[PDB]
Design an enzyme around this catalytic site. Sequence first.
Site, short mmCIF file in Angstrom:
data_model
loop_
_atom_site.label_atom_id
_atom_site.label_comp_id
_atom_site.label_asym_id
_atom_site.label_seq_id
_atom_site.Cartn_x
_atom_site.Cartn_y
_atom_site.Cartn_z
N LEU A 9 0.84 -1.19 0.00
CA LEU A 9 0.00 0.00 0.00
C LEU A 9 0.87 1.24 0.00
CD1 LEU A 9 -2.73 -0.93 2.64
CD2 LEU A 9 -2.98 -0.92 0.16
N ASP A 10 0.34 2.33 -0.56
CA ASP A 10 0.99 3.62 -0.45
C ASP A 10 0.64 4.22 0.92
OD1 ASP A 10 2.54 5.47 -2.50
OD2 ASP A 10 1.21 6.80 -1.38
#
Lengths: 82, 115, 185, 156, 43, 318, 176, 55, 114
Positions: free
Chosen positions: A38-39
């Site tokens: 995930l960012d």
Amino acid sequence: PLTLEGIKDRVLYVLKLYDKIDPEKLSVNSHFMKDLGLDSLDQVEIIMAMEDEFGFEIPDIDAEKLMCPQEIVDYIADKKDV
Amino acid sequence: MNLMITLLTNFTLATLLVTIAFWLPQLNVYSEKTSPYECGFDPMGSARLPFSMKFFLVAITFLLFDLEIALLLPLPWASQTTNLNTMLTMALLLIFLLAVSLAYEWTQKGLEWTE
Amino acid sequence: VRETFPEATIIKPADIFGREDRFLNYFANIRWFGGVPLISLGKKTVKQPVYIVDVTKGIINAIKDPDARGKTFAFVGPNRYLLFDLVQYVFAVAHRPFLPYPMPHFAYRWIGRLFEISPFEPWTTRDKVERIHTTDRTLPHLPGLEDLGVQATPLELKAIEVLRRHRTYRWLSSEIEDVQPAKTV
Amino acid sequence: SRGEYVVAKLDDLINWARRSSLWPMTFGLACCAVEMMHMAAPRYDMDRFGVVFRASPRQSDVMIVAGTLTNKMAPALRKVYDQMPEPRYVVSMGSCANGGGYYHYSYSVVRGCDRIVPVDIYVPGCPPTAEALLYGILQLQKKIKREKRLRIWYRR
Amino acid sequence: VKQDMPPVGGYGPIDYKRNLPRRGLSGYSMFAVGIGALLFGYW
Amino acid sequence: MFMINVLTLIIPILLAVAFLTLVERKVLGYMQFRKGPNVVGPYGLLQPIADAIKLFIKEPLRPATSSISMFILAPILALTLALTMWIPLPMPYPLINMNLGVLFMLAMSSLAVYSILWSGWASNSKYALIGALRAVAQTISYEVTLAIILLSVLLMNGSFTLSTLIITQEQVWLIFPAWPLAMMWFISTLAETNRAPFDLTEGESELVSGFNVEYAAGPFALFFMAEYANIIMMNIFTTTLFLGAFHNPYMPELYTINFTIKSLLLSITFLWIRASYPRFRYDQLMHLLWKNFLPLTLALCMWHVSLPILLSSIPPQT
Amino acid sequence: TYKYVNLREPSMDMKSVTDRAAQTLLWTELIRGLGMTLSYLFREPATINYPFEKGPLSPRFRGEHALRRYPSGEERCIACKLCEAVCPAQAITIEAEPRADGSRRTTRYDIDMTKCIYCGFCQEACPVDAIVEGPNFEFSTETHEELLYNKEKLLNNGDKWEAEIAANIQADYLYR
Amino acid sequence: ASATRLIQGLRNWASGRDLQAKLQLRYQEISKRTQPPPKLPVGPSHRLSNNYYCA
Amino acid sequence: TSVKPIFSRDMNEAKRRVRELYRAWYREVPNTVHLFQLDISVKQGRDKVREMFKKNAHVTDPRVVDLLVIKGKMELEETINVWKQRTHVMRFFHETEAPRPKDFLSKFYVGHDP
Ligand SMILES: CCCCCCCCCCCCCCCCCC(=O)OC[C@H](COP(=O)([O-])OCC[N+](C)(C)C)OC(=O)CCCCCCCCCCCCCCCCC
Ligand SMILES: CCCCCCCCCCCCCCCCCC(=O)OC[C@H](COP(=O)(O)OCCN)OC(=O)CCCCCCCCCCCCCCCCC
Ligand SMILES: CCCCCCCCCCCCCCCCCC(=O)OC[C@H](COP(=O)(O)OCCN)OC(=O)CCCCCCCCCCCCCCCCC
Ligand SMILES: CCCCCCCCCCCCCCCCCC(=O)OC[C@H](COP(=O)(O)OCCN)OC(=O)CCCCCCCCCCCCCCCCC
Ligand code: SF4
Ligand code: SF4
Ligand code: SF4
């Protein structure tokens, strides 16, 4: 607020509501950045979904250090009594 | 009877000047000609927000001085009585008490507006 | 047109909905007439409405493509609907009362000559009755919007854009995430 | 035919009613607003022609775009024009509203108000004089006079 | 030379001040007219 | 044959309104150094027909956000109460000769506020809301003098009957005993019917058009010909109160011509005020009818209560 | 060398106080304003009767552009591009080449009449008085591209209005 | 200045001023629109001697 | 190399400010879709806000991302207070623009652009 298991169940339910999280690979001790991929923006909207569910303001210095649902349910246990 | 005929005629050719203003012209309506008017731009919120009346004390005191013009109004008839000094005393009493009310609203800053 | 001009690009849009249309503007402007008349509650005829920007981009790509000479294109939308749940979705986007009734062939072709007694622009007619209650035939052999490089936009993403005009005031501040999308077939 | 003459006289009456009492809206933007107020001034005097201001766009017929159309007031102009009931007309006064004008190459000027609204009568100038603007309004009356609304409706 | 010039004796003087002519009666005269109108109407 | 009597009353006071628009524009022109309309007909006589036909062929524009029932009902009641205030006015014999027609006039002045009020509420805009509550702020100021002045002028009459009000003024005009009540009733009727210097509801420069900013043509016209019918009615009402002419019962036409020309001169006086004065701020309206007109109104009310008792001039009630 | 507007201390004697109270009660200045309005009611209005009358102008007026000619039929424009150089709006486009007799003439002379600001730098920059800004201001059009004059419309305007532009320049060229 | 003396006197009374001496509507008192040809003077440096531009 | 900072001392506080601005826009998007009565969804709006944040994803300069935070706050204040209209919000969704060429062959076909 009653049981820590119900809080962890509600955390995992909010996490499986979000689209990009795979419900198989999601666990109690899964890391959002290096395991799930995930960012930062995905993690921050996860924490704002937690704010929408549990109903309290989460500041940023203690949402910077929420990289796994273990620390999420432990910090929600910090903000309440249980 | 003639009053009801007059009122019904007035209402009839007051609502037949409305319905001939709708069905006669050409209606080409699309959803920008029916938006609210806020001098060319979009409205900020709705127009149903509370428009706070600063003149509220005068708005109430209009009622208490409008009951006065229901009490002072039979004076063209009360001139016709055979007990006239009492009538004069009661009439000047009512305008005097109305003026005492107006002066108490004056000096305690009631005819002025709030804020 | 096909036999007198042998390269005439004939295009079949199925049923076009838009802002100035007579498809959703017809289904929304029978509300205060008496209750949206149908035949057998309108669950017997099947439609797929195609969106007007998709049809226009199809016409552009038909002008551009030399391969598109002489074809017979059939532009259809991606989702097929019954008429009954289509009119459910129309009166459910506009947030309107909805009490349909069956008006049989005894008198629902005669409401033409009852309801175009004026010589003006007609609200309904008997051809409109026979076309709204006509199903959309499926012609898979013809090339469609997929065969000119057009993504067909379905009904639900633009029906609010069409039918915001008919809401009174009490649900003008509503959303697209309020109405559940209609059942496809 | 007979009904052709009937709808011809009805077109003459309603086109005369629309060209005889054109109500402009109080819309100025720049230097041309001064000259439009001179076209209202007692020398050239629009009000003798049945031409009187209504500030509301709901109760006007012609929108004299008198000035320069920047980027910041393009949707305001479009919403003002959209809130005018049909039939509505547009007179483009001055060079900036016509085709960009003296600020045509600028970064924040809409190059002509025909990019935004449909424009009927172009009145050129910088500014056009109040006599020239009055000539544009009377040419708009000559344009409304040869409309054929009910004749085309009877012939459609 | 022939040029736009003022004439031989210059121009005439130009007034640039206020001139309000002080019309109307006095206050006593106006109240006398009003009260006389009252008394004639009452009689 | 009463329906013909109603039609020959309320059709000419719909033609006189249309030509009051022309008289308004031309007097406003010549008093402002320009000309009025003189191009449409011979010296302007056809511009009212143009304003009549053009508005009722233009698109009506019901707004989306507006509550449509009150939005349609407001100009209906506007034009109805503009028409129904003509019936007790003696011309010299009124249409409906009420016993208490003065109270009919005052009560229908009270009910005529709700057309403006429902128009400013129902037409869902912010300018209309400001124009409706400025109508509230105007009406709570003029209704607290419009009853006492109209009351104290009738204490020399004796009854609330408008037909009696010619018998009262058969010798002298009633402006001579009550000229402060006359010059205050004149301003109360200015501030009643939204005329300048008390526009304040069609405030064209604070608001855009105020309460009727949303009314496009057709529904707007029934406030236009309502307001002008109310000001012609109001000039005739002030004429019958204060300048009631000589009445020969054999020749009613002498009285009819005389109060016709007096009402025309007072309508020209309204146009001559509107062409001359700045517009009030609408608190100054409220600080006028409460702080300035009202104490002198109460003082003259005491004076006109005490004075026929003081002079043995108590008028008959019959 | 300065004056105080609104520094009048009013008198406080019973005569002037009675006069100001009479002004307050009996409305003197209101009757003054109504009297001034009534005095303008009875004047001749300044409304000229357009289009049968015309607004007064001068021979220096800046209206519609035109290319003039010599009194021999030859067009004056010798294609020297000063008018598009000094043009503050850059409304003029000039493209030139020698024609069939070798003379330096234009092939494209466009004045975009909607960029043009009518300031008259081209009528004073032109060394041969070819481009002039004539008398016409009643040239309003129903379409935008009719206000994009080419060389042909400007030569036709010169042939149209030469009988007036010649007299205006004849009356005016001594000042220039 | 075409108004008859009754309207002229009423207008002078209602204005309270004297109006026919100072009219705002123009008449024959203005200059003529056809002017004599001018001969404007030249600048001070239109001299054939001592016209060195650096000075 | 020693210049005056704007609001952030280093990248950590700058990431905190970018993060709080993204929090504000994530809270903002449903109100912007609601009161402007747009035709977009909250998913589409929040993905466009994600695209607008990831458009500037290559900057390691703290002053530049501080000014981007400040200009995002200006966009936010022009969106909360209704100063943008429907059109000024829909300028981000470039909908009227035709789809532009991306590969080499179509850019070769349509014009001389590199
Ligand atoms: C009826 C038909 C028409 C009649 C003719 C009418 C002609 C004039 C028309 C004028 C139009 C003006 C338009 C609106 C003007 C609004 C402004 C204005 O004037 O406001 C009112 C002004 C307001 O004054 P003001 O606002 O300047 O005062 C300032 C007040 N403070 C300091 C508190 C801020 O005056 C009045 O209110 C006075 C009302 C009338 C007074 C009449 C007095 C009569 C005499 C009584 C007796 C006196 C003697 C002593 C006792 C004797 C006993 C025997
Ligand atoms: C069966 C037979 C009948 C068939 C149906 C008839 C319906 C009604 C027809 C009315 C008349 C229609 C014709 C209108 C005029 C046509 C000719 C024309 O163009 O006239 C122009 C002329 C003025 O010319 P203009 O160019 O404007 O002037 C500039 C200054 N030189 O204009 C003029 O000189 C004046 C024009 C006046 C028009 C007539 C008057 C108005 C209409 C009255 C009747 C309708 C009113 C209904 C109720 C309204 C409220 C009272
Ligand atoms: C108690 C009385 C109350 C009166 C109230 C109203 C007062 C004002 C009335 C009107 C005053 C005069 C108006 C004249 C208008 C111009 C007439 C005219 O000439 O129109 C010309 C136009 C075109 O005709 P064309 O053939 O081109 O003519 C060229 C000639 N070779 O032709 C046309 O436009 C067509 C013909 C139009 C005719 C219009 C006539 C006037 C209608 C006004 C309504 C009132 C009717 C009368 C009411 C009282 C009597 C019952
Ligand atoms: C959706 C909303 C509603 C929509 C519909 C609206 C309808 C029309 C509304 C406008 C009219 C309102 C009328 C209000 C009552 C007026 C009463 C009146 O006029 O009284 C005056 C008069 C008194 O005079 P008097 O002393 O009796 O003299 C007779 C001696 N010969 O009285 C007389 O002279 C007596 C004559 C007979 C009176 C008959 C009864 C009075 C009429 C009542 C009608 C109904 C009113 C409804 C009001 C609705 C308001 C919205
Ligand atoms: S066209 Fe020129 S003079 Fe006219 S408003 Fe524009 S800038 Fe001013
Ligand atoms: S008048 Fe001025 S703007 Fe117009 S063409 Fe000449 S130099 Fe250019
Ligand atoms: S118009 Fe005059 S300045 Fe322009 S190119 Fe021609 S000759 Fe030269």
